[PDB]
Amino acid sequence: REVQIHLVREVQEVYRAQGVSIHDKHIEVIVRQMLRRVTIIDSGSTEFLPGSLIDRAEFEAENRRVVAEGGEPAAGRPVLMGITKASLATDSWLSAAS
16 A cells, blocks of 8 residues: 555656646556556465466465465465556457457
């Protein structure tokens, strides 16, 4: 939350200086998309390659399944991604093919 708030304020400062007013709602909509993924430090009982970006909700579901099975959770840390990398890793193949 702290880094998200910092990003919103920092973007807003440029437009405030220049003289264009943009409500922070719009900036927050994008910034939510920026911080929607985690990174894996160690695999363990999970089948996740180290250094692989992963969806947050899917990671939590996988951990919920692996602890129920009896496997230790993977080392998952939230990570910020640039817009380019964030957009490159979509889900549907028909969209990603373009």
